[model samples]
Target: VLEEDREPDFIEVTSLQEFKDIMSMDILTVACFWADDCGPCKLIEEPLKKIAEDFPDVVFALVDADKNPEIIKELNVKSLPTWIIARSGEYLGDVVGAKPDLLIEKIKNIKKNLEH
Candidate 1:
């Protein structure tokens, strides 16, 4: 059983190895790739935090694009504020930009589909 006490917040993934470990968890993950200088990335931070609060079962991960350059290269992330959705270590889809509505809808839809 992989059950454990997981926090309903963003996990700071600083390395490619840590990113792999987080994605490997048996839970839905929304990884936000952001750089410190990106305005839009900072714009979506609060909202993403709130969204994480709304979905306790999901794992929210924050990957610093600048600090973890290898991760961005490995994932082929071309821009800042890239949201990658994954389930059980498999890449499901992505929601790019600072659009919180789209992110919310995506997460909801994924959860709905999983429930069925």
Candidate 2:
């Protein structure tokens, strides 16, 4: 998983347990669902990566939704480019959309409150 290749400003979790593990840190987990042909998703990609850099304290992971449908189904992801910001040890704060600044803002607030 590219999630591991780059020192991963984030970690990609494929299972319910792994996802739950992220919440244990009490830190916000930022996740995005993107695929090759998703135009809006492509547009959102760089911004998401940029936010990963801009907000280093936030845990950001990109999941290939098409490739990992099982996990998506398990997570009950209803749409593409869903932005979920969850505490490391808790499942909460989820946003489903491609809005970069809004996602960033929501995540910052979530992280700000959760990580403390």
Clashes of each: 0, 7
lDDT of prediction 2: 0.70
lDDT against the true structure, per candidate, is 0.86, 0.70
Query: How big is the RMSD of model 2?
Result: 3.1
Q: Could you tell me the lDDT of residue 72 within candidate 1? A: 92
TM-score of each: 0.89, 0.76
* Model 1 lDDT, residue 100, Cα: 92
Q: Which residue pairs clash in candidate 1?
A: none
- lDDT over C-alpha atoms for residue 67 of model 2: 74
Give candidate 1 misplaced runs (Cα > 4 Å). 1-8
Q: Candidate 2, clashing residue pairs?
A: 22-88, 23-88, 23-89, 23-90, 24-88, 24-89, 27-88
RMSD of each: 5.4, 3.1
lDDT of 1 at 5: 28
